[PDB]
Amino acid sequence: AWFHSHAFIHGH
Amino acid sequence: AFIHGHAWFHSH
Amino acid sequence: AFIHGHAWFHSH
Amino acid sequence: AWFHSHAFIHGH
């Protein structure tokens, strides 16, 4: 699974 | 799984 | 599972 | 499961 952050980590 | 938090993170 | 990475992260 | 970061994320 991939997650992105730009902080909160986005992605399920 | 979602990753919660933004340092400690929590994931189930 | 471990969270890889330092922006994109990945976990399997 | 808890993960810690100072970024690399540490924890299983």
Q: Which residue has the tokens 């970061």?
A: D5
Please judge whether A5 and C9 are an interchain contact, meaning their C-beta atoms are less than 8 angstroms apart. yes
Nearest to D5 by CA among A10, B2, C6: C6
H helix or E strand, kind and range, residue A3: strand A2-4
Neighbours of chain B (3+ CB pairs under 8 A): A, C, D
**Buried/exposed code over C1-12 (b: 16+ C-beta within 10 A; e: otherwise):** eebebeeebebe
Give the SS3 label for residue C4.
Answer: strand
Experimental method: X-ray
Distance from CA of C2 to the nearest CA of A (A): 11
- Residues with Cβ within 8 Å of residue B4, at least 6 apart in sequence: B10, B11
Residue C2 near residue D12, CB atoms below 8 Å = yes
DSSP annotation string for D1-12: -EEEE---EE--
| DSSP E strands, C1-12 | 8-10
Distance from CA of B5 to the nearest CA of A (A): 6
Query: Residue B2: its chain A contacts at CB < 8 A?
Result: 11-12
